[PDB]
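Example 5.3 — Pleckstrin homology domain-containing family B member 2
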Amino acid sequence: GSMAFVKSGWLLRQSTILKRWKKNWFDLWSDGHLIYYDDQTRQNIEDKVHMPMDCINIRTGQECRDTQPPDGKSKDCMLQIVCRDGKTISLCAESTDDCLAWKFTLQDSRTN
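Solution (predicted structure tokens):
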């Protein structure tokens, strides 16, 4: 038992294919993997990020760039994971407090 999950849950992710927000299930691993899936069954991977190695910046709220929030939501629900290959992963929680919870956990995950 050297590994476990730190945080899991639904977030909206901005799809670079669909050009709109898509619901995905996220698991954040104790070694800094962030894995996301089509649904909570963890059967269909969308993509992954190695937070310690790949992430060069995290933006939250007003800091987010180039990405419109889902209809009815403010920027304060949004987070962006900026990666070294030039890819940015845009996320949106259901609330400001949910966004801030993900923020601190994702930030900590980069130190793993």
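Remark. Residues 96-109 form the longest helix (14 residues).
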